[PDB]
């Protein structure tokens, strides 16, 4: 509606409603440069989709997980984060903890997937 | 914690807990050789992901199915398979039956999707 990055300056609670607009624009000798550009775009897309798969978020744009939020990563209240801040500011604020969060998300799915298997193994 | 393929010599049970350790390592004129190698890496990844999709296992690493084990592919009990065998030995042991198993998995999903559709058609 607003455009490819039209919500980039909007608050997180507004920009989160345009996730399909950005998602649909991630896929689409001089031949070498053009092919490298296309292969790189594909590789980045697949890295993100694989990472979502590892976390159990495949096929979703808004994925709820079982990892608790640590107040040391960000001590802002939920209203302050979603009503008075943009995603660029948040991305900067949480940059130093992103890999920590990603590790926990992987661990969470690893435990959950085993737990699902055990629930399914009950007769 | 053992790294990529670190569990290769471990038992199947222990190795089943390290799937995410190596899953991340499947995506990551001289320009053509490197570019073709990158494209092949993508094609192999996508063929495996498509095959998981056909079986109804998309987005999961440990996917349980409705295909019974027929005891002719391998007649070992779970104790020997999971606690006294590695994945390389298992892969060799049932290599000749993997195409049979994959075919059954495809057929199982084909029936399941129709059943889900029929269940979803009830008011």
């Amino acid at each position, epitope marked *: 509606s607003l455009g490819f990055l039209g919500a980039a300056g909007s608050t997180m609670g507004a920009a989160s409603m345009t996730l399909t607009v950005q998602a649909r624009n991630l896929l689409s000798h001089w031949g070498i440069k053009q092919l490298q550009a296309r292969v790189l775009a594909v590789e980045h897309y697949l890295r993100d989709q694989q990472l979502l798969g590892i976390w159990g978020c495949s096929g979703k744009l808004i994925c709820c997980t079982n990892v608790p939020w640590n107040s040391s990563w960000s001590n802002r209240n939920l209203s302050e984060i979603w009503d008075n801040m943009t995603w660029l500011q948040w991305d900067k604020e949480i940059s130093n903890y992103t890999q920590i969060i990603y590790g926990l998300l992987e661990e969470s799915q690893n*435990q959950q997937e*085993k*737990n699902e*298997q*055990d*629930l*399914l*193994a*009950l*007769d | 914690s053992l790294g990529f393929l670190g569990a290769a010599g471990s038992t*199947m*049970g222990a190795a*089943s807990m390290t799937l995410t350790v190596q899953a991340r390592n499947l995506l990551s004129h001289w320009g053509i050789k490197q570019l073709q190698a990158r494209v092949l890496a993508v094609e192999h990844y996508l063929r495996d992901q498509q095959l998981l999709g056909i079986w109804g296992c998309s987005g999961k690493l440990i996917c349980c199915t409705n295909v019974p084990w027929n005891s002719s592919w391998s007649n070992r*009990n*779970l*104790s020997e398979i*999971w606690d006294n065998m590695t994945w390389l030995q298992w892969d060799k042991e049932i290599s000749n039956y993997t195409q049979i198993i994959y075919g059954l998995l495809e057929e199982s999903q084909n029936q399941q999707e129709k059943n889900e559709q029929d269940l979803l058609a009830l008011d």
Partner: antibody
Amino acid sequence: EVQLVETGGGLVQPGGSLKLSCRASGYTFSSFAMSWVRQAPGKGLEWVSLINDRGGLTFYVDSVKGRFTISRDNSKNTLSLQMHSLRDGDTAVYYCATGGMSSALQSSKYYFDFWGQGALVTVS
Amino acid sequence: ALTQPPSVSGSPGQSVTISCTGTSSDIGSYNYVSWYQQHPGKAPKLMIYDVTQRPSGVSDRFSGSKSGNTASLTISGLQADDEADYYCSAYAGRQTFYIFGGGTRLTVL
């Protein structure tokens, strides 16, 4: 030889709480499921709760589902049960038992392999 | 939730049958019925599991079977040391894990 020894408490007043703790030895603790089974002084056995080998999954009888918490510590090789809101109907000998579940890659059980000595829990 | 007689008896050295009657959702659907021997003052011991399979350490005098929704344990060669309260444990699915209803006092004459 496999041993399970309960080190829990005795008499608690109605509405209070009591924690039981079972010390396990003689086997790899993390390889087996654990459960609590109770027997009223004049009755037969009653299953109370079941915990998986990793501790991630717990199951209870409906009569205690909102009152008892079952947990494990696989580094100390102990099983704990925290019983809240104790009722007069909960007076029983509580036995620590090994078995009751298999973690998908193990052969099936659905039976209890080892039983502890049993702690006597009473409610005034 | 299982029905089991409160007591049985028989001559020493002879066979006695102890049985539990359940329903289709427990004894019937699942072949996971086990039998326990509880001597007074002691914790129950496992005698039979998976309906017919005895654990190591138990003699061949204890053997079970099932038919329909009824499971039974036959104890041959009754000894003076076999006086105990016997119980069934049926698996009744993921909603109702175990049913321990019962308790048969075995008297050896």
